[model samples]
Target chain A: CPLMVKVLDAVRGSPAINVAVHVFRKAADDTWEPFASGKTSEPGELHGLTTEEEFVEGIYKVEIDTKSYWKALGISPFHEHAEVVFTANDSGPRRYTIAALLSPYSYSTTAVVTNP
Target chain B: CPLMVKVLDAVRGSPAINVAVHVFRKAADDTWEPFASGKTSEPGELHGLTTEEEFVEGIYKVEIDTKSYWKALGISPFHEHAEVVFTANDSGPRRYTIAALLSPYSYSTTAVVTNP
Candidate 1:
């Protein structure tokens, strides 16, 4: 896989299971055109979002709906959602993993990229 | 102040000192308009990035120049930079602290928001 995502509940100090993740590629007109989407599974990981051949070199955005995740846990989140935007596969073919930490009032994200 | 940032080196497991941070607010034309800029201090914390009045309801981007930081430490990094973008002060006037963890091939960011 060329892209993967991991969501962790910082408050719970564990993986954020069942969190929704949406992936989009930047269109030429600066619009985010949806490319793929999935829900995190065990260990808060969502893989197979895109294949290497289809990933391509472009600006991509990975959005996670944290509000619902927190709401499901009976908490109100501050941000409406959390997203990370970055250029991918520009240097060369590589794998990307988005690791996010979530809280009711806060959230954090990190990226791990390596050769595929 | 309404916004702050903390950057850490995941590889070194220490504060990412002197990392350059640039703040931008999404403009009406879909351009990233510069809002504020600063560098991380000893504790990898950046304060006074924006005042309460200036940090109105809008989409904001906080970008950290981790490439230069790693290079300064004689390391080659994967990502060009690390950034976290989110909506701010939409629910109410609040303070936001962005905590980022950086590595040569990985980076993570978390936010701490509170009432000012």
Candidate 2:
């Protein structure tokens, strides 16, 4: 199974709009290379995977377009990319779900795995 | 009696250096005005007050000079002002301590009051 990313808005308590999402994977030299990039459509959720054939230790980075909600929340006005990280449940982990809990001023993420 | 802000370094687990601090008070019209500003001499701790003769409601803004220590930690590059807000204990109307826990990539704050 493949890993997934879920972004939630704080209000509906989940995403209900479109936002840009980017996924990056670490390299052998400690550099990050883009794995995939896309924008949200289903209210505002983005999904990606670190299920590379040569997956070593799954540490994936998820970044969301944050400036869109700043003014509305009265948080300090500015363009900033909100991010979260997840370590895939690679312990026979059949599939994983990484959820990002985000608001104008706060952000948190968690990951869970299910086995076959 | 008064409001105090304490800044700490993550290593020694407490303030061991000086960091600039500025305190601001919110106005009736929602405008923020400077209440006090000063530099630290006690290894990164800054203290200020939201206590005024005509104290209404104690909601204060505390800002710190974040860039000075950013480079040393190698977390990120930029001169961003790290800030935290606190509401003074005005029930018994006593002194309060606002503590800031900060690092290169993350920051947290807490407040406590001691009364007689």
Q: Which candidate is the best by TM-score?
A: 1
After TM-score superposition, the amount by which residue A64's alpha carbon in candidate 2 deviates from its true location, in angstroms, is 15
The digit string of per-residue lDDT tens for model 1 on B1-114 reads 688899888787788899999999999998889999999999988988888778888988887898799889998766667767677877889888888888776666667888
Q: Write the per-residue lDDT of candidate 1 for residues A16-41, one digit (tens) a residue.
A: 99999999999999898999999999
Candidate 1 chain A weakest ten by summed lDDT: A76-85
Task: Give the worst 10-residue stretch by lDDT in candidate 1 chain B.
Answer: B76-85
Query: How well does chain B match by TM-score in each candidate?
Result: 0.95, 0.75
**lDDT value, residue A53 of candidate 2:** 52
Error of 1 at A42 (Å): 5.7
Pairs clashing in candidate 2?
Answer: A9-A14, A9-A15, A17-A43, B1-B94, B1-B95, B16-B43, B17-B43, B17-B44, B18-B43, B18-B44
Off by over 4 Å in 2: A1-116, B12-16, B48-55, B72-79
Model 1 pairs whose backbones collide: A108-B109, A108-B110, A109-B109, A110-B107, A110-B108
- Model 1 DockQ (Cα-based): 0.31
Q: Which residues of candidate 1, in runs, are more than 4 Å off?
A: A12-15, A26-33, A85-96, A105-116, B26-32, B90-92, B114-116
Candidate 2 per-residue lDDT over residues B1-116, each given as its tens digit = 36666777674576635567787777778776787777766656555444446445655676776556655555552225555544443577566555655655445445556675
